[PDB]
Structure formats: structure tokens, C-alpha cells
């Protein structure tokens, strides 16, 4: 049942977007700088073409989106640093827009 010779990759389709799970929480009017901190850290992956910081349920954001046109930045990220714990809850899980579950069969 396992396909071992043909190894599947985590990347497929749109691999130019980072999906980041549980980012810096909000303290009163402190999320403002925690917007910028993203771009400051994420510049290491390449050039931030698009960065979208949304909220969650009208509350503290628990995810963001990064789109680059860079060297295969998401590919680098997903392979090297997915789910890296900073402190308390901040653990940036990384993946691409392969959010779909269905497998081609």
C-alpha cells in the first residue's frame, strides 16, 4: 500500500504561499508591532510579495499568509522549519495551500 520508490512531495500546485499556524497573540494595542515583526522575520525567506495578517473569529489572529516570488521559499520553509516553537504558544506551523484532503484516486 505504501509507495516507497515514488516519494510524494509536500509541495504541489500552489507552493508559493505560506500558511502559518498560531502566530504572536495580542496584548492591548500591542498587535501593532507584532504585525511588523512578521515581515522582519519573514524577509529571511525572501521578498515578501504579499503578506496578509487576518484575524480569527474577530479575535486574536492565529494564522497569517505570506506570498513570495522567491527561490522556493515555501519549499525551503516546509522542509526545514515547520512547527517551530518560539515560546508559550507561538509555534509556527508551515505549509502551503495544499489544504485539500482528497488524494487522486
Assigned domain for 87 exists: yes
Query: Residue 55 region, left (φ>0) first, then alpha (ψ -120 to 50), else beta?
Result: beta
Alpha-carbon gap, residue 3 to 88, rounded angstroms: 38
Which CATH number characterizes residue 72's domain? 3.30.70.330
Structural domains counted in the chain: 1
Assigned domain for 25 exists: yes
By DSSP bridging, strand 17-21 and strand 84-85 are unpaired
Beta bridge partners of 67: 17, 50
Range of the domain at 55: 16-96
41 closest CA partner among 71, 59, 33: 33
Assigned domain for 4 exists: no
* Discontinuities after residues in the chain (C–N over 2.5 A): none
Alpha-carbon gap, residue 66 to 43, rounded angstroms: 10
Burial class of residue 63, CB neighbours in 10 A (0-12, 13-18, 19+): middle
Q: Measured between alpha carbons, how far apart are the two ends of the chain, in Å?
A: 13
Assigned domain for 68 exists: yes
Entry field: residues in the chain? 105
Grid cell at residue 22? 498560531
Amino acid at each position: 500500500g505504501d509507495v516507497l520508490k515514488d516519494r510524494p512531495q509536500e509541495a504541489d500546485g500552489i507552493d508559493s504561499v505560506i500558511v502559518v499556524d498560531n502566530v504572536p497573540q495580542v496584548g492591548p494595542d500591542r498587535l501593532e508591532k507584532l504585525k511588523n515583526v512578521i515581515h522582519k522575520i519573514f524577509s529571511k525567506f525572501g521578498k515578501i510579495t504579499n503578506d496578509f495578517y487576518p484575524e480569527e473569529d474577530g479575535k486574536t489572529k492565529g494564522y497569517i499568509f505570506l506570498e513570495y516570488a522567491s527561490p522556493a521559499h515555501a519549499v525551503d520553509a516546509v522542509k526545514n522549519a515547520d512547527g517551530y516553537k518560539l515560546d508559550k504558544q507561538h509555534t509556527f506551523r508551515v505549509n502551503l495551500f495544499t489544504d485539500f484532503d482528497k488524494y487522486m484516486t
